[PDB]
Design an enzyme around this catalytic site. Structure first.
Site, PDB file in Angstrom:
ATOM      1  N   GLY B  16      -6.384 -13.398  25.901  1.00 35.19           N
ATOM      2  CA  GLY B  16      -7.662 -13.398  25.535  1.00 35.19           C
ATOM      3  C   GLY B  16      -8.692 -14.251  26.099  1.00 35.19           C
ATOM      4  N   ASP B  17      -8.682 -15.425  25.574  1.00 33.80           N
ATOM      5  CA  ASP B  17      -9.678 -16.495  26.178  1.00 33.80           C
ATOM      6  C   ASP B  17      -9.239 -17.366  27.165  1.00 33.80           C
ATOM      7  OD1 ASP B  17     -11.480 -17.117  22.951  1.00 33.80           O
ATOM      8  OD2 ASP B  17     -12.135 -15.875  24.674  1.00 33.80           O
TER       9      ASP B  17
HETATM   10 CA   LIG Z   1     -13.383 -15.557  22.111  1.00 33.41          CA
HETATM   11 CA   LIG Z   2     -12.818 -13.412  25.101  1.00 29.38          CA
HETATM   12 CA   LIG Z   3     -10.636 -11.640  27.683  1.00 27.47          CA
END
Ligand SMILES: [Ca+2]
Ligand SMILES: [Ca+2]
Ligand SMILES: [Ca+2]
Lengths: 161, 161
Positions: B16-17
């Site tokens: 994700g991040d």
């Molecule tokens: Ca995020």
């Molecule tokens: Ca993100």
């Molecule tokens: Ca992402």
DNA sequence: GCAGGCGGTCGTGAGACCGCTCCG
DNA sequence: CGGAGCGGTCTCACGACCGCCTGC
């Protein structure tokens, strides 16, 4: 069903590219209280990685709806309803970190929804958590949601308390 | 050390991040080959959720460096070096989905780095994977990295092959 | 009436890096 | 050196929603 490290992953990924929200949607067609509280979790991503939402969806019993393109190349996967959510969240809560609260507020709303339905005073308590939730999804410097204060106002103006 | 569902989470969150990249950094001070290949994984996030990078860091044996603010309110956590990475990646690879490849290319570079060090022909193979990697981190419609082709060119122009 | 399937959309919060400074 | 600490930065890819059409 779902395995620990698949729940952990989804939770990890949800904390990343996902979102847990509650909304207060206006209803012209409704009865006393012209507002339905709406609950969901979602995963956003660039459409080329769609098969990856895909994956997740299937891992979450095919609840909610995939969207190969939101019109802007960005794909997603949204899960509405206390039904889907009261099955899904408990599996994810133990692994959630950043959005863990939000997930519990939602579950909390879910407990109180049936009694608050036709009960303006209780529907307000419920709408407060709805505020608190959207607040969690904010910068501490942004305008703090105010559905509780604008719904009450309106409930008095309409002699519902 | 690291538990399955903590590795799964971190992998989920990294997908994700986070970001898995390789770079070819120029070196004026170097010997024959004036370029060090640089390898890393990172987690980006809004500084208010910093204690959450924090968490992760500590779960990953305190390798790499946290950065409460990159100067733009956005915090991060970057892990450089084949040392940290050859310990970390194997724990995360089995749970990675979106950036799984990148993680294996990195591991792959890590296997071939010692022989490619003082060997211009082999350093080029290595620099190709470096290309492939940064390509993985792209839109299929973006300009496809070209460190292999600009380093070779230069290696010939300098009679290193 | 009761809600979820959808289509949309501002405003950032990420990503995936580049260059220097530093250190055994 | 040989690399890793650290500051810094363009360009999106997300997030966290609104509003309406659809199902029964
Ligand atoms: Ca995020
Ligand atoms: Ca993100
Ligand atoms: Ca992402």
């Amino acid at each position: 069903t779902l395995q620990p490290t698949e729940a952990a992953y989804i939770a990890g990924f949800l904390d990343g590219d996902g979102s847990i929200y509650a909304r207060l949607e206006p209803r012209p067609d409704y009865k006393d209280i012209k507002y339905q509280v709406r609950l969901a979790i979602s995963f956003i991503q660039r459409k080329d990685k769609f098969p990856y939402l895909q994956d997740i969806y299937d891992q979450l019993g095919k609840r909610g709806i995939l969207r190969k393109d939101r019109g802007d190349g960005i794909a997603d996967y949204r899960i509405y309803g206390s039904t889907h959510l009261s099955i899904i969240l408990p599996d994810l809560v133990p692994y959630l970190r950043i959005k863990k609260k939000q997930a519990n507020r939602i579950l909390h709303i879910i407990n109180l929804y049936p009694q608050a339905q036709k009960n303006p005073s209780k529907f307000l308590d419920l709408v407060k958590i709805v505020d608190d939730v959207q607040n969690l999804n904010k910068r501490a410097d942004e305008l703090k949601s105010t559905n509780y204060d604008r719904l009450l106002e309106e409930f008095l103006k309409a002699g519902k308390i």
